[PDB]
C-alpha cells in the first residue's frame with residue numbers, strides 16, 4: 050500500500066481539487082515548480098502517497114484533471130500551482146454536460162471516459178503498490194456528478210480490489226447554480242452507495258451556514274466555501290501523507306470506519322473555523338479543540354451529530370500539543386457523551402496526533418465520523434427530489450438523453466433504503 | 482467554438498436583425514465594413530482571411546424591399562451577399578402563402594445557405610430565429626423553416642424572438658389567424674421562445690422615452706437592447722454566464738411551457754441627466770413592475786416557475802443578493818409548489834451600449850429579467866379570442882383555403898392553443 | 913484445501929462484481945442507443 054491516484058471531475062471537482070493540491074504542496078514544502086524547499090524530513094517521508102518523483106529533485110501530483118468543458122482546465126493551468134500538474138494528465142472535452150447528470154453519465158461523458166481511463170492506467174501501471182483512487186466532484190452538476198460516477202464504475206471494473214474514495218460535494222438551494230440539483234444528487238448517491246468504499250459528504254448547505262453564521266460573511270463566495278473544503282481535505286488526509294500508526298492507508302481507514310458495506314458516508318468536522326482573510330487569531334486549547342467534535346456548528350455535513358449515534362470516529366489533532374492531554378480530553382468526551390456512541394462497537398473512537406499543523410494555524414482538529422445522523426442530509430435530498438419528481442418537472446432534460454423514469458424511482462428508493470439502514474443501527478441495542 | 486446561427490425572417494425579423502447586428506458591432510468594436518482594431522464574440526461572428534468579421538446570420542424575406550435596404554445601407558459590407566436572401570412575391574399577410582405557395586420555392590435555397598454557415602462551425606449550439614407572428618412571411622415561412630431545420634439538424638437547439646402583434650402598429654386584420662397557425666406549427670420545433678408584445682414596447686417608448694408616435698426604428702432599438710442582454714452571456718465571457726442549454730434548463734420545466742417573460746430596466750430618455758445613476762436595488766425593483774415588461778400580462782395573478790436575472794455593467798454580487806432579499810420580503814411574488822430555487826443570477830461586465838443619435842440614455846448598469854410565469858397565458862388568450870371572433874363567421878378563411886389550406890388545419894391549430902392554455906392552468910395548480 | 917478454498921471463494925465474488933458491472937455497461941449502451949433510435953424516428957416522422 051503506497052500510491053493514491055487522484056481524479057478531479059467537473060467545475061466543482063477541479064476547483065476543490067486545485068485548492069487541495071496548493072494546500073498539501075505548501076504543507077509538504079513543494080513550490081509551484083515541483084521543487085522541495087521545506088526544512089523537515091517528515092514532509093518527504095510519505096511524499097510518494099500523492100506525488101511521483103520526476104527526474105531530479107522534482108515532485109509531480111499523481112492527479113488526473115477531467116471536465117467535459119475546456120474553460121475550467123485553463124483556469125487551473127493559469128492558477129498559482131497550475132504549472133505543477135502533468136500536462137498529459139489534463140483530459141477535457143469540448144461539449145459540456147449542461148448541469149445534466151444524463152449527459153455526464155450516458156452521452157458526452159461516455160464519449161470521453163476512455164481518454165480518462167487511458168491516463169489513469171498510465172498512472173496506475175507506474176505504481177509500485179497502488180492503494181486506490183481519490184475522486185473530488187460535486188453531486189449537483191453534470192460532469193462531476195454523472196461522469197464522475199461513470200468513471201468510478203469503469204475504474205471499479207478494471208481495479209475491483211483497490212479502495213475507492215470520494216470527496217462528494219452535496220448541493221444546496223442556498224448556493225445553487227441549477228434547479229435540477231436534487232435529480233443529479235439522487236442519481237449520484239445511488240451510484241456511490243454501490244461503488245465507493247468511503248465517501249466524505251461535503252455539504253454546501255453546511256459550508257454556506259458556517260460562512261454566513263460563524264464567519265459573518267454576508268455574501269459567501271465559492272472561494273469562501275472552498276477555504277473550508279481545503280482545510281477539511283488536508284485534515285482527513287493527514288494520516289495518509291505523514292508517518293503515523295492509525296489509519297495510515299486507505300484500506301486500514303476503511304476497515305476501522307466501515308462496519309456495514311453501504312454505510313460508508315462520512316460526516317467531516319473541523320476546528321477552529323477560519324475565514325480566508327482571518328490570519329489573526331489567538332485561541333484554541335486541547336479541551337476547546339475536543340469540544341467541537343459534537344458541535345454541529347463545526348460539521349461539514351448539515352447534520353446534528355447529537356440527533357444520531359456514532360458508529361466509528363477518527364479524530365486527528367495537529368500542532369504541538371500534549372498527547373497525554375489529548376487522550377484525557379478524548380476519553381472525557383466519550384464518557385460524558387456515552388449516549389451518542391454505539392455500545393456494540395467497543396473502543397470505536399480512534400485518535401491520531403500529527404506534529405505538523407496546517408497553514409495559518411498553530412493548532413487544529415479534524416474529525417471523521419461515521420454517524421447515523423448523516424440520514425438528515427439524505428432525507429433533505431429525497432424531499433427536494435420528490436417535490437420535483439411528483440410533478441415530473443424538468444424530466445424532459447433527462448428522458449431527452451435516453452433515460453427512463455424507472456432509473457429515477459430506483460435511485461430514490463435506494464437512497465431512502467440507506468436512510469432506513471442508518472435509522473436501524475441508530476435504534477439497535479447491545480441486548481446481544 | 483460554441484457558434485450560434487441567427488435567422489431573420491420577414492420585415493419584422495430583418496428590421497430587428499438590423500438593430501441587433503448594429504448594436505453587436507458597437508459592443509465588440511466592429512466597424513460597418515467588418516474590420517476591428519475578449520474572444521467570445523466569435524460565437525456570433527466568423528472571420529475571413531482579410532481579418533474581416535462576418536455575422537453568422539441569414540436574412541430571409543419573400544419580397545426584396547426590406548433586405549434591399551440592408552444591401553444598400555451602412556452595413557452592406559458587413560454581410561456577404563449570399564446571406565441576404567429575397568424572393569419576388571411576398572406572402573401578402575397570408576400564412577398559407579408563406580408556408581406553402583410562395584415559401585416552397587425559396588425553402589431549399591435558404592437551407593442550402595444555412596448549411597454553408599453550419600459547415601463553418603466547429604461546435605454549432607443551434608439557432609436564434611427572429612420573426613413576426615402577424616406577417617405572411619414571419620408566420621408562414623418561419624414555421625416551414627422550423628420544420629425543415631428539425632429534419633436537417635436533429636436535436637440542435639432552436640430559440641425564437643417572436644413579435645407578438647399590436648393594433649397600434651398592426652398592418653393586417655388577419656394577424657390573429659397567422660399568429661395561431663404559426664404557434665401551432667412551430668410549438669413542437671422550438672426549445673424556447675421569447676415573445677415581444679409590440680404594444681408593451683410602444684407604451685415603454687411613449688411613457689419612458691417621451692416619443693409621441695413611436696416608429697419601428699424606436700421599437701427595434703429598445704428590442705435590440707433586450708436581445709443583446711439575452712445574447713451577451715454567449716458573446717462575452719463574464720463572471721456569470723449562461724449558454725443555449727443553461728437558459729432552457731433553468732427556465733423550461735416542460736417542453737410546451739417554453740415562453741419566458743422578459744422585463745428590462747432602466748429605460749431612460751437621452752435628455753434630463755438627473756434621472757441617473759440608478760442602483761442595483763432600483764433596477765431590480767423595476768423588473769417587478771408590469772410597466773417594464775416586454776409582454777402585457779399580470780404576474781401578480783399568475784405563478785412563477787423560474788426567474789433569471791441578467792445584470793450588465795457596474796454590478797457586484799453583494800448588491801444583487803441584497804436587492805433580491807428585499808424583494809423576497811414583498812410576499813406578492815408567488816412561485817409554484819414544485820419549484821424551490823427561484824433565482825438564477827448572471828453578471829456581465831460590459832455596461833449597456835447605446836446607438837449614437839438614439840433615444841436611450843447611457844447607463845452604468847442595466848438588468849434583464851427572464852421569468853417563466855403562468856401569467857403569459859393571458860397573451861395567448863387575447864390572441865385566441867380574436868381568432869374565435871373571426872373564425873366563428875369563417876371571415877377571411879377563403880384566402881387560406883384558396884392557397885390549398887384546409888379548414889381542419891384552423892380547428893387543429895386552435896385546439897392546440899386551447900391545450901396550451903389548459904397546460905398553463907394545470908402547471909399553476911398545487912399537487 | 914482450506915486455502916485454495918479462499919482463492920476460489922475470492923473469485924466467485926470478483927466474477928460476480930464483473931457481472932454486476934457488465935450489467936451496468938449493458939444499460940448505458942441500451943440508453944445511449946435508445947437516445948438515437950428515438951431521434952432517428954422523430955425525423956422518420958417529420959420527413960413524411
Ligand SMILES: Nc1nc2c(ncn2[C@@H]2O[C@H](COP(=O)(O)OP(=O)(O)OP(=O)(O)O)[C@@H](O)[C@H]2O)c(=O)[nH]1
Nearest residue numbers: 491492493496571572573574613615616617618619
Ligand atoms: N417590432 C417590430 N414589429 C414589426 C416590424 N415590421 C413589422 N412588424 C410587425 O409585424 C407584423 C407585420 O408583419 P411583417 O413582418 O411586416 O410581414 P412579413 O413577414 O414581411 O410578411 P409578408 O409581407 O406578408 O410577406 C405587424 O404586427 C407589425 O406591427 C419592425 O421592424 N419591428
Ligand SMILES: Nc1nc2c(ncn2[C@@H]2O[C@H](COP(=O)(O)OP(=O)(O)O)[C@@H](O)[C@H]2O)c(=O)[nH]1
Nearest residue numbers: 059060061064187189190191192193220224271
Ligand atoms: N463548494 C463548491 N461547490 C461548487 C463549486 N462550483 C460549483 N459548486 C457546486 O457544484 C454543483 C454544480 O456542479 P458543477 O461542479 O458546477 O458542474 P459540473 O461542471 O457539470 O460538474 C452545485 O451544487 C454548486 O453549488 C466550488 O468551487 N465549490
Ligand SMILES: [Mg+2]
Nearest residue numbers: 492544571616
Ligand atoms: Mg413583408
